[model samples]
Target: SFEPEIEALKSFKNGISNDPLGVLSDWTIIGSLRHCNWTGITCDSTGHVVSVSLLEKQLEGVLSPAIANLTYLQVLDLTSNSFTGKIPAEIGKLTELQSLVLTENLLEGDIPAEIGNCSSLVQLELYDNQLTGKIPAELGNLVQLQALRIYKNKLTSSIPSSLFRLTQLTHLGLSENHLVGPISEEIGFLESLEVLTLHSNNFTGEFPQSITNLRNLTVLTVGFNNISGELPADLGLLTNLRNLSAHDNLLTGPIPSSISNCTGLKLLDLSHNQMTGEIPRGFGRMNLTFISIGRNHFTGEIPDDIFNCSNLETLSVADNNLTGTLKPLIGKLQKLRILQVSYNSLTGPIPREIGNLKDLNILYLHSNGFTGRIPREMSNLTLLQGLRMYSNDLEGPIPEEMFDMKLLSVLDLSNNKFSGQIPALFSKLESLTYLSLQGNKFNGSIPASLKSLSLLNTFDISDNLLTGTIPGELLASLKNMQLYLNFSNNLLTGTIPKELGKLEMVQEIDLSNNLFSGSIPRSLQACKNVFTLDFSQNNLSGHIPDEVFQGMDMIISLNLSRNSFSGEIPQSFGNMTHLVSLDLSSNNLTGEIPESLANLSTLKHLKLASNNLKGHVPESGVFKNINASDLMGNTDLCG
Candidate 1:
């Protein structure tokens, strides 16, 4: 009753250090015929083990090399486990092995070179593991391999050329590795290949021209590499190509007009490159859904003909030299969900027709030369989530319907020529997380309706002509304010809100250049996490509250200049370990400069000038390079 297959199965159980799921417990009572009934084991008519699949069993231990004893074994899958150490080189002895899958494990060391001996291996998967070292050229010996995935490993060096020669290879993945050198030219001959991914590697050189010969290729991604070359003029030869992504490279030249021949193409991303020329009108004939050609030197108007492609859902052409207007014909892309055209030189009013994209979720039209008011038609995009149109020339009152989008999360219109009383209807946007209206010509009291915008984490309304006390209700509602709060450079005339102290998570609070006439609030001591506090150029007159400096170890820049604060510098200044700049100049303080400041290694800019302090200045640390402007107007300070 001797059986090598039973012994091989036993060896597999012996190699495991811990099988928490007890997946191999059935191997214990191996009574001849019972061996065929063991868990995860399949046998032939002669009772020779033909398959053993133990997927995601939480099995911990080494893969037994004795598994090679099952000469007739056709499949061995041990995916998603903690099995450690090298893949058993003896696995090559299973000449009939058809599929070897060991993905998502802790297995390390070089892929066994002897695995080339598995001539019948049609599928070999070793992805998402800690496997290191170069892929052996012996892998090319798997002449019957239909799929070979060794991606997401620490493997290095160029791919062995023999891999590209396998006529049966339908899938080859070598992404996320340290592999270098030009992709082998022979890869073009992988005529049966449906998917080829070599992204996130150090590949360099012009893409092989022979790639156009791959007739059956469906998806080819070589992103995050150094491959440079103009797209092939005959790129349409890839009739089955559906998705092609080659972003973040030095590719140059224009998109080939012949690409329109690829009628089946759905997604084409050539972003973050040095490419030029007008987007070809030929793209209109294709069924492309996602077209991202952003961050390039692309000039000329966005071809209106391309909008005829009704399947287009996302069109990203931002940060380029694209000129002319977005045509009214853009309304034809009714299914468009995202349109990012920011940071470009595109001129003309944002066409009202853009509102026709009822499915639009995000629209980034910032930092461009857009003219005219936001068209009323934009309110039709009921699903809008984010709308950033900051730094443009568009002016006039925002339409009331702009606030109707309940899903609007981010709305930034800063640094524009917009002039109007901010509508109280802002309360309708309950999902707002970021709301900025800075550097506009709006004039009105801060709306109490804004208090309901509790979801806002970043709220900037600085440099407006607003007049009112800081809303206590607004400050109390903003418990999650982590970025900053800027009410600076406005015409407000009221005391700084004591409710500002409730922002425990905020980092910066700038309420400067206003007519606020009051003392710094004692409750502000609760703002321990605040780093940059700017209350300068205001009508504030009182003793600087020392309690405000307590637990302010994170304060990096504190500016209280152009104020009438009349007291000695707080001794707590030395406790601020990260203080980089401190400006308390033009104040009525009368005392010696604190010597403790010299011990602050991070103190870079210190401006204590124009104070009534009458004593010897500390001649150490950053004060040694003190300029005359720093000590000017102070009554009697000397070094």
Candidate 2:
């Protein structure tokens, strides 16, 4: 019988295949037709057909109701296949059926109400299927049903509360469905239940308190549902629990301390909720690896035992009210990898022991109140990729060992009081793509070796005493970069690089308030993708080319204010299709306002004020959208 069933399923699979090797022909058996000698068939004590099993055969065909011919069948399993079409009503004839597993299949059509005829069923699994129409309310008749799994299907209907009468149920999984309404309070009656999951569904209303009644419940995940309500204070009574994830829901209020009753817990995620109150202190000792309580109003001091969790690796308490000084005990977490303690009120110097964990990779201690010298031990973490200590009170030279990290990509020490010579090794960091040493007292020449980082997408060293000519290689080597290059407000001098025009992918090029003393290069017109171009307050003197805005159709901002461009305004400026801001104030451009400039319909900020232009303002497409102050100081250029 096993061989026949496998052969039947194999034929069904091969029916859709164009080649023999592509078919499932190996699923077969010989003529030993008694008991368990067959492939997937079983028999009763009387040597009569009892069960058939074919789990994950990848068979692609419709199920044949002839399967009911096995009159003695008590268990049937055809799970993880691609069987399509309607399940026949003839299956109800199998009065001996006790367990049915048909999950992860392509089965379509309505599940026949006659299925309620299997009165002796204890466990039924029909999940991850295309079964449509309403789940027959008659299924509630199976008083002996212990496990009901019908999740991840196209079934649309209210879960029958009658099914909750199965007080002997131990497992119920009905997630990822269109089932609506509140969980039946009667579900709490299943005292024998151990695992219950009904997440990622359209179910609305409060979760039943009967959940707390299931003393044996261990794994309960009712997340990503529309259910809204506070947990009962006694939720921690289920001590046998291991995993509890209730994220992305509207459940509010303080996290109950009663959760400590589930001391056997290993993973708990309560993120993306309006959960308020302090971090439950009793939970700090749990031996969990992954703990994320971000994006909530969890306030108060972080417990010391939080760092004591030797098993904890990824701890994210970001976007919360967790405060207190640097816990030196963090060094004890040798297994820690990604520590995200950002967006908090934490203070004190960073723990020196942080360097003790040689495996620490991504460390985000930004938006805090940490002060004092950056620990030199930071150089010891060879695997560090993102080391951001920005917006702090730290001071001193950057450790040279930081440059030695081969995997170090993003290093941000911005808005700090650090002061020293820019390390010579900084130029040799080839893996660095984003490097920001802005708002520091570092005085030195920009590293020429920084040019080797062709992968450098963002390089900001602004508001520093660093002095040097802008390296020509900085523009030539950065062809693949897409982010900004902010070297403005520094002592950087020399002519602006005309080769920068080749950077068609560059989004921003800010070199404002610098000593760049060359004319605006005509080659800049090639940067068609440049969104921002700021060369203000520089000593640059030259005629502004009309073709500058010709090729850059994506330019949204162009500021050449306070330059020495002595010429008439180009009427061709109207060609910039996406220009939103245009500032040419304080230039020596003297002429009548170009009437052709009225074509920039997208222009929002137009500042020709303080220029030596003499004429009435043009009635362009964007003229009416702004105030007269945009053209002020140019007495002749009346609005």
Candidate 3:
């Protein structure tokens, strides 16, 4: 048997196609009797290899079938390695094996059912692999097994019912797999189980009511599945539970008031489910660090006691039908970091007590019916990174304290009644990336301080009473702009700034409904990536430059209506194959609509009204199906 063990060691060493660390070099030089001296190999005094630990060695290759020759091996650990290929089924021959850990490897193939032959196995860890196929029911034979982990693999099918027979099992993880079918009631058989995770799978059906049998369970997670039915009403029976997560599922019905029965719970997430009914009021008593029940149908006021969880860090209840105003008691969560309650019908002014959450990092209260100005105290949250309060009834000047939050990165307050000069202190927000204040009563010129927001991706101030020229300095600083640059429907005056061309990364530019004069800046051609360009309802004069259209190959909407631009429409517009909407009505242009415009097959709305352009509109492509209104207002346009 010792001779076979030596040969097996040599075969295992030979199978490694890569050994950058030279971990196996000693194996080839060692004699059969001195094999114990080799790296990662341990032997008893009688020269029997008892263990092999080659963790984090960066070794890559197949596992040799000869490994079974180490009949006396008790522990085999090759975790955090680059080992690939199937785990040799011959491993099951090591009947005396007590622990086998091969986690964080690139190994694939079905876990050999023969592994169940190692009846004495105490711990088996094979997670973080590419392994496929259903778990073998034969594993139930390992009655002595305590910990079993096969998570983060491609395993499919229902968990083996026989697995429940392992009465002594304590830790079981089968998460992040393709496993389906109900978590059967037999799971209750594992009386000694402490931790169970089956997240991110296709498992369906009602939550196993039998789970309540695990009186000693501490951590249980079954998120991201199709599991339906109400959670067991007696979930509170497991008083020892600490962490519980079951988000992104179809579980419905009220959160059982019994959950409050487990006061020891710390982290809980039951979000993105179909659960209706009010949050159990008793949950406020738990000493939790994080709690999320968002995207559900829960109604009624948020319980004031829940905010009293002093140690709570995250409280997300977004996308729900919950009503009632956020209460001042929210200030009780001194340790709160993220708070989201968006897309609800909650009314009433945001309680000013929110400023007490000094540790808050992200706050989302958008798409609600909140009234009143943003509380000035929120500026006290120096650690805040993102804040959204859009689509509300909030009015009045934005609190100046808000601009002082130096750590802020995203601030969205659009579609509100906020009124005041656009703040000039935006330059202080060096980390700002997204800042939208559109559709407000904001009056005053674009602030020059905005030039400091070099990282800004979007800067929207449209539909405001803002009056001023496009700031050249502001445009120059937006080199990293990615989404858009909107300044449309304002009282702004002046020619389109040539510096606008510097926004090369910007995809859309809307400057319509302003007092802009002069021809469209030729430098705009530098915005080669722009997809939608709107310059309508302006005093801009002169011929529309063909250069503007030549480089806008991604053009989807080109609106230049209600302007004084005189001359033939740019024939170069034909190059824009993606044009969907073209508006040039109420212009002084006199000439035929270029036949080249017929190339726009995607065009849905074509506006050439109120122009002196005389032409026989080509009956081809999008033009054939367009409504007559799209071609009206032209004295001589016909087909």
Candidate 4:
């Protein structure tokens, strides 16, 4: 027996091409006759190999068929390794295998049908691998199988019904695969099953009613599938169910009232489906901590009874046709963390009672028809992080208490009718990253206190009555403004802050339609990452700098229209190959337009009107599509 074991162990060592841990260095025939001393090898008293566990050893090589020669192998665990190549069919020769775990590996090829010959295998885990092809129907022969997990692989085709014959299986996870076809109603045969997860697949057809037969089931997830049809009327029969997730499916119709029978349920997600009708009042009786029914066709006023679930942590009915105001009783759920009801038709003011949920972090009521100001009591939510209520008809000034929420990072209140001076205390929001209050009636100076928001990335306060100098301190400290910085269509009066050059990551900067008067700051050339820079309708007068054009390689739109700038167009502008819109209209620029301007093939809107330039507009490249009005104001200009 020891001679045969040595030969088999040597064959395993020979198959390895990359052993980073040097695990096989001791696997040599010249070593002692105690082959059991080899790495990952264990032998019985008779010197027969009985176990081989080499988990997470960084082993990268093909598995040798010689492993089959260890017919006494009871446990073979090679999990969390880099082992490649197919699992040798000869592994079926291990008639004594009890636990065969090869999870989190690079193993490819179909799981060999010969594996079914291992009649004693109890736990078979091959999850998180590259295994392809259908599950072998022969696996049904393992009547002792207790758990089968083969998820996160390239396995395709419907699950073999024969595998369901393992009545002793308590856990079955076959998710994240290319599996298709309907889940067989025969799945009910797994009477001992407790957890069944088959999400993120292409399986179609309705939820099998037979699943109700699993009285011991606790977790059932079949989301991200093409499954349609209504929930079975008796789904609550599984009284022990804790989590039921069926989001991103084609399921339709109302949630059944019988779900109240699952009183132990903690999490429920039926979002992104064709679900309709009002939420069943019976759901209020379930002890759910999190519930999401978003992206559905649900109608009717949200049932106020839902607020009765005092244990609720996250409640989302977003992207639906839900109507009615949030119930004030929602404050009773002290553990609520996230409340998202955006993209709905809900009207009325946000209930002040929401502040009672001190644990709330993200609140999304945007794109709604709500009215009135944000409730002052919301300041009580000290853990709040994101507050989005954009595109609403809400009126009145923002609650001063909102700025006190130290954890607030994202605040969007754009496209509203609120009128007031922006709060000077906005600087207190040290964690603020995004601040958008555009398209409102906000007046007074841009807050100088904004410099405190060191994490600020986007600041959009455009189309407002803001009147004052752009604070140099605020502009210089905006090194974190990466996405956008807009102050357009305001009564702002001052020279462009030279410190604006510090925003190296800013992509768009719109300072158009202001009363600023001065030469464009040469420091602006330092913003090499700026893509769209708009200074249109200002009183700036100066020569365009060739160095400025040369430094802005990523410039997409350079708008200085209706300004008093003089001098010729910089020939260095040809280097801005990404420029799409160039506006120099109504300026005092003289001399010929550089023929090199034709190099901007991406130019779409080119406006040089009212300039003092005297030159022939080239008919090549972008100029070939130029119109007469763009050249009319310049009297000396010719084509």
Candidate 5:
């Protein structure tokens, strides 16, 4: 180990060869003075080199230009490894390099502007690498560089107004790169810059009012940029600012109440911006902890001590308009955990101190104008999982301690006005998964105690006015019910359930505006994860299951339209390889037309006309994008 310890043991064995897709696939070489016993190597103690700490192992291969022999390499640790090629421009013969951590690695090409001759580099960590072209304008000759993290790699051009010549730069991470132009009015010449992470980059124009001249700036993250103007009201003069992430930008007007003098403002993300007025009532004294002014347009109200932020924990003003209500000290934000004030136009009801937020878990008041009921004092939120009061106007019932919450998993009381019944107390919600009581007014039937909520995935109770049927051993022990199962505009009926092909994880099934009759249920042939098979305006009659799209190969939408299902058509539904949207309209079904569903080249919407089916229409897959109104009322099915 000579001069700075032989290229600091090749940046300390490039962190024990951290694999970045170089997929270790085996590479072990631990010896030479035991290089601090490998695994993300780090050494010093007269080991010559001062520090070569390897962060994040995953060491891949290559980098062996015998690490230009580490001449007393002062801290040359390899950050997250995968050490792809290039980067070894003999690391400019390590001039006592002080902290040259190669950030997230996979070291690509170029970047070796012979690292602009290292010049006593002070922390020039190349961020997540794939190091593309540009940016190596000899990195402005490292003028005692101070923490310059090149974030999430693939670095492109622009920014080098000679990087404001370092001026003892302080933490300036160019986030997710592709760095565009504008902003370097010599970035106020880095006056000991203090944390300016250019967020998800492509940095367009504006935003540099010499960044309010950094007066010892404190974290200014410019979020997802495409940045357009406005914003600078001298940005409240960075008054000892603290974290200001300019959200999804295109940033327009309003919002500059001099950002309440950055009284050490805590995280204020102007979400998905276009930014409009209001909302800045000094944000009731910024002591924030995640406050996204979601979707942005931002109108008024909302300031009832906006949950008095005692270290607020996630308060996204969903969609956004604002308005008031909801503030019973916002359940005194016992570290609130996600409370999206849904849609907008906000109304009242809901506050039972919101069940004293036992660390509330996602409560979106869907749509708006919320009415009464719902407060069985919210079953004291035992770590509630997801409760969306859909299209509110809410009425009574429903409270069996909110369907026996044992960590209720997603329950939307759809288009409310809810009535009674149907609530066989949710057979003790075995972690119920997604249950939307559609357009409410529930009656009886459905509950075979919902087959003991075997982790029920999604089961929307359509336009409720309910009746019975549907509970065959509760859709046969739902083998992992996958997405939909809307009992279509219900009234309830029978049959159709050949025990639902014993639901082997049923994918999608909407009993469209039902009145269900018989036949059609060859247990939907054990739904191999069936995908969208809507029994349209049902009364389903006979024969179309010639192995109903046999052995499903990812079926995609096959609506047996206005059914009275007679026959024909199912020539193995053209081996359903992801069949896309095929509505067999008004069926009576005779023969003809099944030239194997015209070979369904990924059928895009093909409604077999008012079926009587005679056939002739051949030529493949959704008959090449469909026409003849998708075979209009097939009084004879033509090609």
Candidate 6:
């Protein structure tokens, strides 16, 4: 009589209240069976308390339903920690519990359907936390359950058709959770199910073709969810399926050429889904390795026996309606690496045995209609990295054997029909970072070997045929021009470039319709994370400074229109309060207008039409949604 297991381990250490890892400070109590030597005690040979395993002990406690008097407790691994209230329906009087792991934790109410009277549970991990209502279909009386990981949490209704009477279930995690109905064709009576994670959740109906009678299934993540029909023409009778993630989902027909009898499938995500025909041709004798049927409405082609799988690697049929031609037996998938055939309607050409894929890394052949040219054996893709062949009709030039692929980082050859020039061997690809050659027909200039490519950061050469100047030591050698610094509608000229204030984490800076002139660079107030600053119809002149709105306060679309700025106007553009679209139209600015630009409050697109500004215009915040031809060409402004 260990006196009710030492008064249930002193009511679980007096409901904790906080044990910053002093892990129950040796749960003291001199003798009287010294909590079987405390510190996450583990008694057993009859004195009970068989296992407490308090993991991530930042334990803050409140789990005492007098811990079911600890009688023969068998493993209550309170995982991760900060445990809060409500999991004790006297913990179903722990009928010899076996691994009831309280996962992650901050545990909230309602998972206690008297925990199905703990019928000798076997590994029931209450996942993530903030646990909410309804998962209690009396936990199917556990039936000696085997692994039931309650997903994310906020558990909603459904799935409890008495939990399909837990036929010795094997790893069933109800994913994300706010779980709604459908999935139960009695989940094929568990039959020792092996890995069934119902994804995201809000689960709707259909697709349960008795889960193809789960012959001991293997990793079936029912994706995002709204699970629709089709998908189970005997899903290859689960031939011990391996990773079949029904992506996004609202799934439709096709894709079940009995999935080539699951020959040990490996990673098959039927992406997005509205699935149509084609794409199976028996996935080259399976043993597949990552295949996402992109977006979807899949049509024909793309099945040169899936390049005979040979341990294929990530092959996505992007935005489908697929047509033909990527065959050179796709360089026989020598351990291929990410080849997403983008926006398909695929035409021909592009098969320079894809430069024998030297373990390629991301090559999305964008917007297809691909013609020829681009294959200078893709500079033998020295472990290539991100290459999107944009809007293809793929034309000439651009193949200086891709300038010695120094692990080429994101290079999008935009709107292709590519012409010559613009590649001082892209500055020897010093691991370039996001360089989009927009609307190409690339001409000369703008590439003093791109300021020695110091890890270039998103520099798109807009509507190309680019002219000269605008390079200020390539904007002071791209000090990581954080995502965007486009020289728009290229014909670029000089002046505007206080080395663009050394990039300072750029986020949009389009030197619009270029021929850029000067002024306005108070070291661009060190572009504190700029947000869209386009120097419109360029030829900029003086007066737009006010410390460039002192770090654009995260300005949203500020275009200095048809330039030639004169004075006045800068009431610090009303201190930007995240201004949304403000264009200083036809510049030559004169005074008036600033009632602190109507205290912005997130101004919405206001272009001070042709300027020479005069008096009267503060209609009201954001000027009552202004519109008098947006304050008509400032004809000595009156209203």
Best candidate (score: lDDT): 3
Task: Report the lDDT tens digits of candidate 5 across residue range 403-484.
Answer: 6568868888788888887777777777877888888888877878678887787888888877877878888777668777
TM-score ranking from best to worst?
1, 3, 4, 2, 6, 5
Residue-level lDDT tens digits of model 6 in 463-549:
888887766787788876777877789887877767778788888888789887767678778777887788788887988778767
Candidate 2 stretches with Cα past 4 Å from truth are 1-49, 65-71, 86-90, 108-114, 131-136, 154-159, 203-210, 570-572, 591-596, 614-620, 637-639
TM values, all candidates:
0.96, 0.88, 0.94, 0.91, 0.35, 0.35
lDDT of 1 by residue, 481-554 (tens): 88879999998888888888788889988999999998998877887888899999998998877778876678
Prediction RMSDs, each to the true structure = 1.9, 3.7, 2.2, 3.0, 22.1, 21.5
Return the lDDT, model 3, position 347.
92
Model 4 Cα lDDT, one tens digit per residue, 500-553: 878788899999999999787778787788898898988888998788768888
lDDT of each: 0.87, 0.78, 0.88, 0.88, 0.75, 0.82
Candidate 4, residue 195: Cα displacement in angstroms equals 2.3
| Worst window of 10 by summed lDDT in candidate 6 | 25-34
- Cα shift from native, residue 9, model 1 (Å): 1.3
Give the residue spans of candidate 3 off by over 4 A: 28-30, 601-605
In candidate 4, position 391 carries an lDDT of: 93
What is the lDDT for 575 in model 1?
Answer: 84
For candidate 4, the TM-score is: 0.91
Relative to the true structure, candidate 2 reaches a TM of: 0.88
Best by TM-score: 1
lDDT of 3 by residue, 247-308 (tens): 99999898888887998999889999999898777767888998889999999998888977
**Candidate 5 least-lDDT 10 residues:** 18-27
lDDT of 2 by residue, 112-147 (tens): 998898888888889888888877888888888888
Write down the worst ten-residue block by lDDT for model 3: 630-639
What are the clash counts of all predictions, listed in order?
A: 0, 1, 1, 0, 36, 0
